[model samples]
Target: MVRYMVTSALPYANGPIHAGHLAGAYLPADIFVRYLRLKGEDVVFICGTDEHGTPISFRALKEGRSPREIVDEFHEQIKITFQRAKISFDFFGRTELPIHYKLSQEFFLKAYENGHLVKKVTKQAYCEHDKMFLPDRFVIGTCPYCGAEDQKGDQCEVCGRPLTPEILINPRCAICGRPISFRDSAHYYIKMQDFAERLKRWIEKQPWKPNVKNMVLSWIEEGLEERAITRDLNWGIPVPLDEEDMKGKVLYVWFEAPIGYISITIEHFKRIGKPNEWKKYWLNIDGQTRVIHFIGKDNIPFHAIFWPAFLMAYGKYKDEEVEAEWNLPYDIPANEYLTLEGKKFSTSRNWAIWVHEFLDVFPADYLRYYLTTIMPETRDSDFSFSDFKVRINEELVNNLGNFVHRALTFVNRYFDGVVPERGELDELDREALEEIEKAFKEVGELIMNYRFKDALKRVMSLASFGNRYFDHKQPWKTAKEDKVRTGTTVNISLQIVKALGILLEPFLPDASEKIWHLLNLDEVKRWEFRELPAGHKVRKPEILFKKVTDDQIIYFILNYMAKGNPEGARILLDKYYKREDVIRVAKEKFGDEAEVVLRRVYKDIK
Candidate 1:
C-alpha cells in the first residue's frame, strides 16, 4: 500500500468558510482522503486554521480585540463548521500550537545553519500612525494592472495579479487608514534561486495536472528570487535566531504555514501514542510515500514552488550525499474558484453563505451532493440558489432517490420486504449487472485521479441506469403474469441498490448510510461490488431526498440574506420587483419571506 500524506490549504481564522473555500480546497481533499481510506491505503489528512498572519491581526484591529482572541474564537467555530460539513480530517490543527512553533523553528534553524539563508536589509512599508510594519494584506492601494482601487498590498482582487507593496500606488495602512512610508528593516531570506535547476528537473519529471503544472512553469520561466522569510510581527512564531535585537521578528506566514502539515501529522501520531509514525510519510523520500496538496489556484505557488524549495533546502541541509532525503509533493490538484451567483464570493463584502449558518437549515449530505457535482475541478464554477434547487429536486430527489425508493418499495410490496430468490439470468439482467460493474470501476478511477466531478457523475449515472432497468423490466406488471420473473427483476434491482450504497459513500456519506439502512445491510467495509443475498431482510423504505419547491428555495435565500443583513435582502428584492411587491412580501416581519424582503431593503438603502 502506498503511504499518503494529504493537506488542504490552511484557511485563515479571520473569517468563516464559504462555498468558494469549500470547493477550492476542503471538499476535494476530504473526498479524496475518504476514497483513499475506503481503498485501505495508509493516508493521513492534515489541515488547520492559519492563525498567525496579517489578516488576523488586521481583523483584530478592526474589531478592537486582541489577535489571540480573534483566532481563538474563530478557530473553534471553523472546526465545528468542518465537522458539520463532514470534512473527515484525520487531525485539524492550528499554527498557534506549541508543537507547530517548535517545528517551524527547527526548520528555520536548520536552513539558516546550512548557509542557505541570505540575511539582508530592505525598505518595507511602515505605518507611522500605527507604529508598525505593514506586511502583506495590512495595506491597500490601487491595482497597477486593472486600476482597481483598494487592492490589497500583496495582490489585486479585481485583476487577479500578484502585487508587491512597492508597486501599490498611494498605499495606505489598512488598519489606521493613514499614509505609509518605507523604513529600513533587517530580515532573513531563503535562497530560492539556488534550487532552480533542481526544481525545474523535478517538476518536468512528474506527471502534473495541466493547470497546476502550467502555472508553475510560467512562474519558473520568469525566474526565482530570494524571498524574505522573516517579518517584523508580534503575533507569530518568533524567529529562532539567538540575536537579542531580533526578538520582534517572526517567520512569515507563507514560510511557516506549510510546515503546519508536518507538525499536525506529528501531533496526530503523538496523540495516538505513536510519535515515530510520522517519519514514514515525511522523512521517507522514496517513491513509496506520496504527498499531495489540495489547494486553490491562488495558492499554487506556495504548494508547488515555495514548499518544494523548502523541502529541497531541508534535504540538502540534512544530507548532501543522498539524492532524495525529504518527501516532496507528489501532486497538487489545485482547483479554480466557485463563484456565488454571478459574482465572486467576498467575506468582507458579506456575499457568502457561511457553513455554520447553512447547517442550521439544510442536511449536510444535500449540500455535499450539490457542491460535489459542480466542483471546480478543471475550471471556475458558479453556485446559484436556483441551480441548487433544481439539482436537489430533480437529480437527488427525482432520479437517484426515486430509483432506490421504487426498487425497495416494489420488493416490499411483492415479496414481503425480504430479498427474493433469483431465477435464471436474462440478457437484460446481465447488462444491468455489467452496467453496475462498469460504473463502480470507472467512478473509482475518476476519484483516485482527482476528477471528482466526473466521478460523481458516473456514480449518479448508475442511478439513472437502475431507473431505466426497472422501467424496462416492468416488475409491477410481471407480478400478475409471471411470479418467477418478477422475483428475478426485484432481486436484481435490490442488488443494484446495494452496489450504489457502497459506490456513493465517498461523495455523499449520509445519503449512502441511509441507503444502507434501507437495504437493512451490514456496514459497508470497502468499495466493492456485491449483491444482496436472497434471504436478507430489508428495512421499511423511506424517501432519501425531499422535493424542494421554488418557494422553499426562495425562502432559503431570503432567510440567508436576512440573517446576515436584512437590509441587504430588501434591496435585492427591490431591485427585482416593484416596491409594492417587495412590501407585500415584507408584511410577515419575522418569518423567512418577510425577513428576506426586509433584509434586501437593508442593503439597498445603505
Candidate 2:
C-alpha cells in the first residue's frame, strides 16, 4: 500500500467554525481522506488548532483573560465541532504542546546554523500605551488605497489587499485605541528567495489544480522576498538561538503552525506505540509516501511557496543529521471561498452558521450531503439557507433516500425481508447491471480526480436510475401475477442499494452505515463489485433521511438574534411572525414589561 500524508489547514483558535471554513478546507480534505481509507490505502490525516497567532491574544485581551484561557476554550469547542461533523483526523493537536515547541525550535536552529537565516533590525509598530511592540493584528488604520476605515495593519478586509503598517493612512494601536509609534527591532528572517527557482521547478513537476499552480507561478514571476521568521510575542514557540537580545522573541506563528502537522505525526506514532513508524510516512528517502495539503485560496501562497521553501531548507541543512529527507507536498489542492447567502461570511456582522450550533439543530449527514454537493471546488460558491433546505429535501430525501427506502420496504412487505432468486435474465436486466457497474467505476474515477461535485451527482444518478429501473420492471405489479419475474426485479434492486452504500461511504458515512444495517451486512468495504448476492437475507429497513421542515429553517434563522444579529433575525421573523398567535408568545414570555418593546420591534420590521 502506498502511504499518504494529508493535512488540512490548521484552524485559528480565535472563534468557532463556520460553513465557509468547512467548504474551504476541512470538508474537502475529509472527503479525500475518507475516500483514500476506503480504498485500503495507508493514510494519515493531520490538523490542529493554530493557537499562537496574534488574533487569539487580541481576542483574549478584549475579553479580559489570558491567551491560554482563550485557546483552551476555543480548542475544545473546535475539536467537538469537528467530531460532530465527522472529520476523521488521525491526530488533532495543539501548537502549545511540548513536542510542537521542541520541534519548531529545532527546525529554526538547524536553519540558522546552516546559513539559511539572517538576523536584521527592522521597523515595527510600538504601542506605548500598552507597553509592548504591536503585532500586525494589534494595529488598525484607514486603508491607504481603498480608503476603508478600521483596516488592519497587515491587510484590508474590505478590499482584500495586502497592506503594511507604513502604508496605512492613520495607524493606531487596536488594543489601547491610541496612535502608534515605530521603532527598530531585531528579528530573524528566512531566506525564502533562495528557494524560488527550486520551488518553481518542483511545483511544475507535480499535477496541481490549475488555479493553485497558476497562483504560485504568478507569485514567482513577481519575485520572492525574504520573510521574517521571528516575532515579538511571548505565547509562541521561542527562538532557539541564544542571542541576549532575542529573549522575548518567538518564531512567527506561520513558521511554526505548519510544523504542527509534522509534530502531530510524531505524536500519533508514539501514542499508538509505533514510535519509529512515522519515518515511513515523513522521512523516507524513496519517495514511496506522498503528501498533500488542503487549504483555502487565501492560504495559497503560504502552502505553495512558504511551506515548500521551509521543507527545502530542512533538506539542505547539514549542521545536524535529520531523521529523513524533508519531502515537499505532492499536491496543493486549494479551494476558493464559500459565501453565505450571497455575502462573504463576516464574523463581525454575525452572518455565519456556527458549526456547533448547526450540528445541534440538523443531522450531520444532512449537512454533509448538502455541503459536498455545493463544495467550492473550482470557484467561489454561495450557500443559502433556502437552497440548503431545497437540496436536502429534493436531492437527498427525494432521490437517494427515497430509492433506498422503497427498495427495502418492498422486500420487507412482499418477500419477507429476504432477497429473491433471479430468473432467466431479459435484455433490460443485463443492460441495468452493466449501467450500474459503469456508474460505480465512473464515480470512483471522478473522486480520484477531486471532482467531488460531479462524483456526488453520479451517485445520485445511480439512485435516480434505480427509481426508473424499479418502475420499468413493474416489481410491485408482477408480485401479484408473475412471482419469478418479480423476484428478479427485487433482487437487482437490492444489489443497487448495496453498491450505493459502498460508493456513498466517503460522502455520507452515517447514512451509508444505515443502509448497510438495512441489508443485514457487515460494514461496506472500498472498491467492491456486486455486494448483495441473490437469495441473501436482509433485515428490516428504516428511513435513512428525515425531511427538514420549514419551521426548522425559520427557527434556525431566528437564532441569529442570540448571536447579536437582530437584523438577520428580523428578515425571517417579519414574514413568519405576521400572525398574532406567533407574536402572542412574545407577550406571554415577558408580560406587560416587554409589550411596548415587542410592538416597537414588530412595527420596525413592517
Candidate 3:
C-alpha cells in the first residue's frame, strides 16, 4: 500500500469551530483521507491545536486570565468538536507540549545556523506603565489607509492592508488602552527575500488554485521583505543563543506556529514509543510517502512559501538528512473562504453556528455531507439555511436516506430482512450492473482528485440510479407477481445498497455505519466500487437519516433573525456577546477603555 502523511491546519484553541471552518479545509481532507483508507492505504493524519498564538493570548486577556488558562479550557472543547465531527485524526495533540517546543527550537537553531536569520534592533511600541514592549497584536491603532479607528498594528481589517506600528495614526496599549510609545528592541529576522527565487521556482511546478497562485505571485512580484523572527513578548519560546539577556524576547508567533505541525507529530511519535518513526515520514529523501498540507487560503503563504523555505534552511544548515521532511509539501491544497447566507462568518460577532451547536441539531453526517457538497474549491461559496434544508430534505431524505430505508424495509417485510438469492442475470440486468460499476469508477476518480463538490453530486446521482432501479423493478409489487423476479430484484437492490454503504462512508461515516448495521456488516472504506454479494444475511431495518421538518427550518432561521444579528446569527446572546463590530466601535470611541468591557463580557460568558 502507498503511504501518506496528511495534516489539517490546526485550528487555534481559542473557541469552537463553525461551518465555514469545515468547508474551507477540514471536511474535504476528511473525505479524501477516508477514501485513501478505503483503498487500504497506510496513512497518518497528524494534527493538533495551535495553542500558542496571538489569538489564544488575546482570548485570555479578554477572559481576565493567563494564556495558559485559556488554552487549557478550549483544548478539550476543540477535541470534542473534532470527535463529534468524526474527523479521523490519528494524532490529535497540542503545540504547547514540551515535544512541540523541542522540535520548534531545533528548527530555529538549524535555520539560524544556516544564515537564514539576521539579528537586528528595531523600534517597537513599548508601554512603560505596563513595563513591557508590545507585540503587534498587543497594540491597537487607527488605520492609516482606511482611517478606521482601532486597527491592529500589523494589519487593518477594514482595509486589509499590511501595516507597521509606525503607520498607525495613534496607537495604544492592547492591555491597558493607554497611549503607547516606541522603544528600540532586539530581534532576529528571516531572510525571506533571499528565498524568493526558490519559492517562485518551486511554486511553478505545483498544482495550486489560481487565486492562491496569483496572490502568492503578487507578493513575490512586490518583493519579499525581511520578516521578524523574535517579538517583544516573553510568552513564547525564547531565542536560544542570547537567553540570559533575551528574557523579554522570543520567537515571533508567526515564525513558531507553522513549526507546531512538526512538533505535534514529534509528540505523537514519542507517545507511540516510535520516536524514530517521525523521521521515516518526515526525513526520508525518496519522498515515497506523500505529505499533503491542507489549509484555508489565509495560510497559503505560511504553508507554501514560508514553511518550505524554513525547511530548506534547516536541511542545509543542520547537516541533518531531513531534506524529505523539510522540503516542499507534496501538495498544498488550500481552500477559499466559506460565507454564511452571503455574509462572512464571524464567531466574535455571534454570526456563526458553532460545530457543537449544529451537532446538537443534526447528525455529524449532515454537516460533513453538506459542507463537502459546497466546498470552496476554486472560489468562495455561501451556505444558506434554505440551501441546507433543501439538501437535507431532497438529497439526504429522498435520495440516499430514502433509498436505504426502502431497500431495507423491503427485506424486512418480504424476505424476513434476509438477503434474497440472485439467479442468472438477464442481458439487460447484466449490462446495467456493468454500467453502474463503470460510472462508479469515474466517481471514485473525481473524489481521489479532491473534486469533492463533483464527488458529492455523483454520490447523489448513484442514489438516484438506485431509486430508479427500484422503481422500474418494483420489488414490492414484483414479489407478489412473481417470486423468481421478486427475488432477483431484492438481490439487485441489496447489492446497490451495499455499494452506497462503501461509497458514502467517507462523507457520511455515521450514517454509513447505520447502513452497514442494517446489512449486518462492518463498515469499510471503499477505494473501488464493489457490489454486495448474494445470500448475505441482512439485519433489521432502521432509519439512516431523519427528515428535516419545516418547523426546524423556520425556528432556526427565525430565532436567529429575531436575535437581530444575522451576520453571526446568535453568538452575542448564545456566546458572550463579544461582537466584533461592537468591539470596533467601542475601541474607536474609547481606545483601551473598550478592553475592560471585552474582559467583563468575556468573564460574564465564562
Candidate 4:
C-alpha cells in the first residue's frame, strides 16, 4: 500500500476561518486525504491550530487578553467548526500541547549539537516602556510597500509585501505608537543556506504542482536567508539554556509550528501504546513512509525553507538509499487565493464568510463542491454569489441531486421504496456503465495528482452521464407497457446514485455519508468503492440541496460588500444610509449627489 502522510497548514488561531482558509488549504487537503483513505492507502492526516505566533499575540493585545487566553478561545471554537464541517483531523490538537513543546526543544538541541545554529548579536526592536526587547509585532509604522500610514511590521496588509521590523518607514511602538529605538540582542540563527544546494537537488526529484514548483524555484533563485530561531517574548516555551536571564525569550513560530507535526505523530504513537515507534517515520529513510504538506502560498517560505533545514540538521544521516532524508516536505501542494464574492476578504473590514456562519446557512458539502468546481489551481479565482447560484442550480440541483431524488422518488412511488431488480443491459446502457467507471478512474487519478478542479469536473461528468442515461431510458414512459424495463432503468440509476456517493466521498465526506445512508448502507469512512448489487435495499431519500431564495442571496451579497469596504464601520454605514437619502429624493433633484457620491466598492467580498 502507498503510505501517504498528509498535513494541512495549521491555521493561526488569531481569528475564525473563512472560505479563503478552507479552499486554499483545509478543504483541498481533506479531500485529497479522504481520497487516499478511500483507495485503501495508508495515510495519516494531521493538523492543529498554529497557536504560537506574533499574530496571536498581536490579536491578544487588541482584544485586551493574554496571548494564551486568546489562542485558547479561538482554538476551541475553530476545532469545533472544523469538526462540524467534517474536516477530519487524525490528531485534533494544538501546537502548544506539551508534546509539541518537548518535540520543538528536542529538535533545537539536536540541531545545535550538529552546529546548525549560529549565535549572533543583531539590532532588534526594543519596547522601552515595557522595559523589554520587542518581538516582531511589537513594532509597527508606515509601510514602505504602499506608503500606508500604518502597517504591521511583519507584512504590509495593504500590498502584501514581506516586511522586517527595521524597515517600517517610521518605526513606532505597537503598544503606544511612540518612536522606538533599536538595541543589540543575542539570538540563535539557523544557517538555512547550508542546506540550500541539497534542497534544490531534492526539489528537482519530487513531482509537485506547478504553483508550488514556481514558488520553490523563485525562493531558490533569490537564495535562502539565515533566519533567527529565537524571539524576544515573555510568553512562550522557555529556552533550554544554561544561562538564567534567557527567561523572557522563546522560539519563533516558524521554529515550532511545523515541528508540531512530528509531536502529534509522537502523541498518536504514545496514545496507541508505542512511544518509541514515532521515530520510524521520522528517522527511517527507506521510502517506507512519505510525508506530504498542503498549505497556502503565503506560508511557502517557512515550510519549504526553514523547516526542512532544521529537520536536516537534527535528523540522522542515511546513505545509499535516499541519502539525507529528514524533515523534507515530499509534496507541498500550495494553492492560490480564493476571493470572496469578487473582492478580497479583509477581517479588519469585517468582510468574510466565516466557516462557522456558513455552516448555519448551508451544509459543508455544498461549499466543498463549489470550491472544487473552481479551485484556484493556477491563478486566483473569485467565489461570487452568481457562481455559487449557477453551480448549485446546475450541478447540485439539476444534475446530481435531481437524479438521485427522481430515481429514489420513483422507487417509492412504483416499487414501495425498495431497490428494483436490474436486468441485462442493452448496448447504450452498457456503454454508459463503462463510461462512468472510466470517469471514476480518471477523477481518482486527477485527485491523486492534485488537479482538484479537473477531478471535480470528472466527478460532475459522471452525474451528467446519469442524467443522459435517465433521459435515454425513459423509465417513466416505459412503466406501463414494460414494467421490467422501467424497473431495470430505475434500478441502474439508483446504483449510479450509490456509486456517486462513493465518488464524492473524498470531496465531502459528510454529504457522502448522507448519500450512503440514503442508499441503505452502514456509515463508514472507506477508501474502496464498488457498485452495489442489483437489488440492494435503499433507505428513504431526502433533499440533498435546498435552493437559496433571491432575498437570501441578495442579503449574503450585500453583507460581504458592506464588510470589505476599507473605510471602517462608521464610513460604510454612511454610504449605506447615503443611498437611503437618494431614494427619498426625486430622480431629477438627486442628479448631482448621485454622480459625486464616491462609493467605496471593494474587490471580491463574499
TM-score, candidate number 4: 0.88
lDDT of 1 by residue, 1-606 (tens): 688899999998887898789888998998898888878889999999999977787778788899999999989999999999999999889998899999889889878877889889888888887788888877677776667678774545576567876577778888777988789889998988888778878888888866667777878886688998998887899998888657798999889999998888889899989976777787765458889998998877877788988887776424333344678888888888888777777654577777777677778887888898899877888887767878988899999999999999999998889998989989989998898889878888998898898899998889999999998989989999999899999999988898889888888889988998898867654876778888889987898988765445445556676556555455555454565544454554355556445545554432
2 against 4, candidate with superior lDDT: 2
**Higher-scoring candidate on TM-score, 2 or 4:** 2
Please, what is the whole-model Cα lDDT of each candidate in the order they appear?
0.82, 0.81, 0.74, 0.74
Better of 2 and 3 by TM-score: 2
lDDT of 2 by residue, 189-287 (tens): 888878888888887888876666877798897667788989997678888878798998899998988888899888988898998677667675566
Q: Tell me the spans in candidate 3 whose CA falls farther than 4 Å from its real position.
A: 153-163, 209-215, 316-325, 523-525, 528-531, 554-606
- Cα lDDT tens digits for candidate 4, 515-545: 8888888746454446666556776768777
Off by over 4 Å in 2: 153-157, 316-323, 561-563, 572-606
lDDT of 3 by residue, 147-197 (tens): 777776454456546776567777788788889977887778889887899
Model 2 worst lDDT window (10 residues): 315-324
**Ten-residue stretch with the least lDDT total in model 3:** 569-578
* TM-scores, each model vs. reference: 0.92, 0.93, 0.88, 0.88
In model 1, the runs with Cα more than 4 Å from the true position are 127-130, 140-151, 155-162, 171-174, 285-287, 316-324, 562-606
lDDT, candidate 3, at 170: 73
Q: What TM-score does prediction 1 earn?
A: 0.92
